[PDB]
Design a protein around this ligand. Structure first.
Ligand SMILES: NCCC[C@H](N)C(=O)O
Ligand SMILES: NCCC[C@H](N)C(=O)O
Ligand SMILES: NCCC[C@H](N)C(=O)O
Ligand SMILES: NCCC[C@H](N)C(=O)O
Ligand SMILES: NCCC[C@H](N)C(=O)O
Ligand SMILES: NCCC[C@H](N)C(=O)O
Ligand SMILES: [Co+2]
Ligand SMILES: [Co+2]
Ligand SMILES: [Co+2]
Ligand SMILES: [Co+2]
Ligand SMILES: [Co+2]
Ligand SMILES: [Co+2]
Lengths: 314, 314, 314
């Protein structure tokens, strides 16, 4: 698979700052080398230079709106560039607010994309339903066409144009959804598989339904926004908003192995890895290592094994 | 849902004493506040005052029979009171021997109840098949009509009257059943899903079958006796008789979320939480926190989220 | 069930030496006593005396070929002896290279046997596809009839005769398969259930398919080669080649409980337990205890309980 790597060292979508170190620790773990170790054509576009916006007072309750808005506007441009280069954009991120730019830029080149959002959260709060004011919990609200008219004019997001319909996204792993968020899910008829559904059906059926749901009518590019807190904190502890009872390491790899097999992966986000939040050096490496494994699975690494098209017995 | 909370600080059904602190640590974790935080009508009936019975020599091998018998007789009265008040009895317990009084009192108001027993143990030893002499491993034998005639006249239990038939109970999570207990299961035809069945069918099918088994003929009140050792000790370590390979945090919440959805939960027991047995301050909080989560799920807290009947988008 | 215990304190199939202590720590944990505690007829044949072969230079890249070859030749003889005694051979092993002798000796008495290989690895590298040179990752290549002609004349294995066809073996738990190994799987059409298949179908369906696959045409003796690294290192950490995302404790017991129920278990290998690799005294006991539990399940210990054919209520 051909990849376009984009480091997005950004954290202003939430309170803890160590998330901007995500691109660095993932590269350090040898993500490029390992990807290349597979039949992968890897091109690193480097880390986007997110300049500081010193003047960025809250918009009502919403924090760092201009900084978050600018980072996504800049990222949207980069992602559209890599997509125009015929490569799968791989955004090594900071916080999940960056999904606004990643999906936006991706949709500019492939308006028919479908989204799979692996997360413990729906991140669909609007600037008016949010209680935390953290934009990493509102990315989906800015992207949904059905919600346009419910999103106030927030400084820094005038460039945004809702690019996805409520029917073009599936959530997997939900276990901490706010009331307003749940109201939005039920009201717009958004397809989701919370941890309850995963327990009920098993990850196998969950994925069968997810892909059938998004690819049934017709094949379309797939955007996978993977928030590492979607997995249980026993696997990815170094993250800002962890929630117990998450998806297992195995389910995480299953999700990605299945998405890979579709041959339709078009965009990928590996978000919320925050080394600074690891209670120990080992929790940090455990989080980074799991984040790498998930990424590799998205690009072909299978647990049953892989082999080149040659005669190994000769 | 409307709840009637009853603290049962009792431990004489087994050897370790810290179990009588269960009501205290659960209240401390803010169980009342959290329940009220939901659309819950909560009334605390307080902690029952289990007076000491200084003279209580063993009945053969059975220990503290008068103390255990009295605690259940007193609890049976309280539970019947809260049930008569039109509320779901929530017994914050000490050891599982208290199930004798909780189910007995519940059955006085609702004789048609069905029981779901989540536990690593069947707790169905009779005073004659028990080898430990601990009454927390014999509660079910005193309640089963089919076993009346096999239970000797034990001091303190003359007030008991078997109130449930072998067909009105389902076990979930079994993994440490004594030989005599297993003989009773097979002989009376008791429905159970040991860890083997959960592994085979998945918790989803297990619950489908459980509810169909108990509610098929007709809807009836449900009594859920949840022993925290039913869950794996990785989740609830501070308990007296832990057994590895237990139900997961997720399966525990799935069990309860499904029971809640029936709208038939009538009685609930959260038992065997023993803070004094936590190897660390964290194992204690981990056990208490999991015990609280399970309780909240029984009363409506769903992992996919919850929302009031208002227009959140306005 | 009637058992013939054979200790195989061998480690030259891989680099770390503590694996030869496997028989000792398993016996110490009281494996004999516990087996006898069940309706088991247990006969200990003791630990085979694997004499040192001082002169054993590598064969190309392959290490300790004469030592490994001799240990398996000696073990093959013992296993055939216990099988001739009408007992299920239970090989308490060192490294997995010993599977060559165990399956070879077993097949001498029961040529129609079927093999279930529980492992994170396929251990099917040939002396020419191996990159590590460790023979514990090549046992299956020496046993497969279809691969005879692809295995060079390695010092110490002239006694070997491929005894199993590619169709008589099923793998369960795979998650670290080398490229050449994967090529062999696909080329010979070997049946396997990697962790991906377990996630997809659930261990219940995996076992249904496994047994149907091997016993469909006709009932035949079953050889279970259980590598403890097949289970997740959270359960069996003290092992030489651990791989995350393994089978759970529950799945491990499910696998074995199901095999037991067939009444066809004929040979068993409990391999790769290396006490010397436990980061703590507790990781060692955790590994040994899990290894014992798996063994007991193979011989009748069920999680739902067991009872003798008597009237426990009397
Ligand atoms: N920050 C205003 C409160 C909005 C609330 N989170 C809701 O949508 O229910
Ligand atoms: N990214 C996690 C979001 C957490 C919470 N729902 C919030 O809106 O802040
Ligand atoms: N304490 C008398 C022994 C009874 C034994 N637990 C049985 O029922 O098999
Ligand atoms: N409450 C756990 C019971 C443990 C054992 N079956 C006993 O009878 O003591
Ligand atoms: N040691 C020679 C390299 C063989 C390689 N492991 C392969 O079979 O692809
Ligand atoms: N026994 C584990 C084998 C590991 C690796 N495939 C090897 O051939 O050395
Ligand atoms: Co999240
Ligand atoms: Co998120
Ligand atoms: Co119990
Ligand atoms: Co119990
Ligand atoms: Co292995
Ligand atoms: Co192996």
């Amino acid at each position: 698979r051909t990849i376009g790597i984009i480091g997005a060292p950004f954290s202003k979508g939430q309170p803890r700052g160590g998330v901007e170190e995500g691109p660095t620790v993932l590269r350090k773990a040898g993500l490029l080398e390992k990807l290349k170790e597979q039949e992968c054509d890897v091109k690193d576009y480097g880390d986007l230079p997110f300049a500081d916006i010193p003047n960025d007072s809250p918009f009502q309750i919403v924090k760092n709106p201009r900084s978050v808005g600018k980072a996504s506007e800049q990222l949207a441009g980069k992602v559209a560039e890599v997509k125009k280069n015929g490569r799968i954009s791989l955004v090594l991120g900071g916080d999940h607010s960056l999904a606004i730019g990643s999906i936006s830029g991706h949709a500019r080149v492939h308006p028919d994309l479908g989204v799979i959002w692996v997360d413990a959260h729906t991140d669909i709060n609007t600037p008016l339903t949010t209680t935390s004011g953290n934009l990493h919990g509102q990315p989906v609200s800015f992207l949904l066409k059905e919600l346009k008219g419910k999103i106030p004019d927030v400084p820094g997001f005038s460039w945004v144009t809702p690019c996805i319909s409520a029917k073009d996204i599936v959530y997997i792993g939900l276990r901490d959804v706010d009331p307003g968020e749940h109201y939005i899910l039920k009201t717009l008829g958004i397809k989701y598989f919370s941890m309850t559904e995963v327990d009920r059906l098993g990850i196998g059926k969950v994925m069968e339904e997810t892909l059938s749901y998004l690819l049934g009518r017709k094949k379309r590019p797939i955007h996978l926004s993977f928030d590492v807190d979607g997995l249980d904190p026993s696997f990815t502890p170094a993250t800002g908003t962890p929630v117990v009872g998450g998806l297992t390491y195995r389910e995480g790899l299953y999700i990605t192995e299945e998405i890979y097999k579709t041959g339709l992966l078009s965009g990928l986000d590996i978000m919320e890895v925050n080394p600074s939040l690891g209670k120990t050096p080992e929790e940090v490496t455990r989080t980074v290592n799991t984040a790498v494994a998930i990424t590799l699975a998205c690009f072909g690494l299978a647990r049953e094994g892989n082999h080149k098209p040659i005669d190994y017995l000769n």
